[PDB]
Design an enzyme around this catalytic site. Structure first.
Site, PDB file in Angstrom:
ATOM      1  N   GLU A  29       0.793  -1.220   0.000  1.00  0.00           N
ATOM      2  CA  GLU A  29       0.000   0.000   0.000  1.00  0.00           C
ATOM      3  C   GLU A  29       0.829   1.275   0.000  1.00  0.00           C
ATOM      4  O   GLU A  29       0.516   2.255   0.721  1.00  0.00           O
ATOM      5  CB  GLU A  29      -0.942  -0.082   1.226  1.00  0.00           C
ATOM      6  N   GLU A  86      -6.618 -10.717  -1.243  1.00  0.00           N
ATOM      7  CA  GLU A  86      -7.363 -10.463   0.003  1.00  0.00           C
ATOM      8  C   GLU A  86      -8.843 -10.386  -0.367  1.00  0.00           C
ATOM      9  O   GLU A  86      -9.581  -9.525   0.147  1.00  0.00           O
ATOM     10  CB  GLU A  86      -6.924  -9.175   0.723  1.00  0.00           C
TER      11      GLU A  86
END
Ligand code: NA
Ligand code: NA
Lengths: 330, 328
Positions: free
Chosen positions: B131, B238
């Protein structure tokens, strides 16, 4: 339902998907039928007693409403049924004197009924259950007793198929029966249909009623029956499918709802059955359920009057059950 | 006895689940029956591996790795360098001031070396950087202490340290909102830049924290194509399908509605058909959980609000979503 799969579309490459109906359930279940099916059968109103209740009195109004509904939604129609030991009025077998009629007179009456009914729906109905349930469901004999058989002789079925073929030679003509996967009865059905085809009789298909339970017939039994009947070169339709929550020995009247275990096993059972039907898509051309949702099923009163059963893919509020999701995902 | 997910997709990609030692016990049979890959939800993050300098607490990660290895499951390592779940000590000196670039690189290297070498041979890939790209604005990268202290080559360094520690591992850049066109183009630009510099980055991790409607199938297809054009491996890392749109903070629902359940089923069938279509470029699909009795979405973004995002329900039964996913 907005995002729900449509049964006829999921199975578009495999077989038609049908429902049995009457004018009342077409109104009550109209949107489910419109959304899911591409075939209709009359549950009762094309049986002999509902079409010719008195000699020369034909009452086509209910059947006409069912055909009109199907044709206006581009649905096929299976005609059910011409010659059966049930739901046939006594007049058919009797003379004025009361006594049984002769073979020749009963053949004339069979020909007239078949001709008048099949010609009325020619071009709208593409197949007919010409003979229903003639094979014995118990014991060692091939054939069930019936007045048709008693008065005409054992060639009554040959004659019925020949009369229906003459009335509409473009129709597909079926022998239809239940308990069709139990090996002894399967061998009787096979022998009978083999013998008729071996004489050149226009029998084009076998209708497997599939009034099944959670346990019976086994998947191996269904496979063996589909293979056995297909080996005759006929078309197969699964004609009256439902999956009862009760085995034949279970005559309980007290259950007000299916258990979770019944609901889960029924889901598994319907997934297994549809996987097998899809595997035999080259010989099975139509799967009709004897209804569409659990708010209407003949199994509420058969074989036990006045109970409740939950045999179909949609519940009483017309919402999909666990069985729906397994059936459409094969 | 249901179809097994790893089997249904055997010719397409691995099927994974996020776990911790409590959910391995609570969901053990579902994991054994369905997955061939495991990710630690939390216990291989920096704060759970090196909570104080020189204090390594591998016990929980070891338990997850032992479970996987005992059941022939691959393991994805998650995650070495991230702005979240990293303890304050990492960026500070003894006097509480920020450390220099060189001291932070030493610390980054020591952590990566120790953690990656421990699991070498058992963990086949690592989310090395998590991220790093910004939410909004024109700036490519989000601010972070890692980036502030080291400079913008902090990612380059993390990947070289991870490669050195295990040259046989697949090394990933992992991120969410990966199919929104603006963010997709930043992620593309970043990975392209590292690749052309020769940095050992092998994979892009698409987190796929999705809703019933966003991103669109057209957005997902464009992103798969854009990233695959880099020549990297793609993992869906995810996956979950929230019953709520991200800005929908409503809290009134105690059970999914029939519409929720049916739309989610259609959504999951659409997504798996697309994944299958792109089987040539996708090699693993991991869900951020396995059944609705455990999901991070029960407390994000609304604390204590139940969600129903996965293929199995709270009783470990297959949902409509399961059946549509395996139908493809
Ligand atoms: Na077919
Ligand atoms: Na693949």
């Amino acid at each position: 339902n907005s995002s729900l799969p449509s049964l006829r579309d999921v199975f578009a490459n495999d077989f038609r998907i049908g429902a049995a109906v009457n004018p009342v359930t077409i109104e009550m279940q109209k949107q489910l039928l419109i959304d899911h099916v591409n075939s209709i059968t009359a549950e009762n109103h094309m049986k002999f007693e509902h079409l010719q209740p008195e000699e020369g009195k034909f009452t086509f109004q209910e059947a006409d409403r069912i055909v009109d509904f199907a044709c206006s939604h581009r649905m096929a129609v299976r005609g059910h049924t011409l010659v059966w030991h049930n739901q046939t009025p006594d007049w058919v077998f009797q003379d004025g004197q009361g006594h049984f009629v002769s073979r020749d007179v009963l053949l004339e009456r069979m020909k007239c009924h078949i001709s008048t009914v099949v010609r009325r729906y020619k071009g709208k109905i593409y197949c007919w259950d010409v003979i229903n349930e003639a094979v014995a469901d118990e014991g060692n004999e091939l054939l069930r007793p019936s007045k048709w058989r008693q008065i005409i002789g054992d060639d009554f079925m040959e004659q019925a198929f020949l009369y229906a073929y003459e009335a509409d030679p473009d129709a597909l003509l079926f022998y239809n029966d239940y308990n069709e996967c139990f090996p002894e009865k399967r061998e009787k059905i096979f022998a009978l249909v083999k013998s008729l085809r071996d004489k050149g009789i226009p029998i084009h298909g076998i209708g497997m009623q599939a009034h099944w339970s959670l346990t019976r017939p086994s998947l191996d039994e269904i496979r063996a029956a589909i293979e056995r009947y297909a080996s005759l070169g006929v078309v197969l339709h699964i004609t009256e499918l439902d999956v009862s929550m009760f085995e034949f020995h279970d005559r309980r009247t007290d259950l007000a709802a299916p258990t979770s275990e019944m609901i889960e096993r029924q889901a598994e059972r319907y997934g297994q059955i549809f996987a097998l039907f899809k595997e035999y898509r080259d010989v099975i051309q139509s799967v009709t359920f004897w209804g569409i949702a659990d708010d209407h099923t003949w199994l509420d009163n058969f074989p036990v009057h006045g109970r409740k059963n939950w045999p179909l893919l949609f519940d009483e509020q017309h919402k999909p059950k666990p069985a729906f999701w397994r059936a459409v995902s094969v």
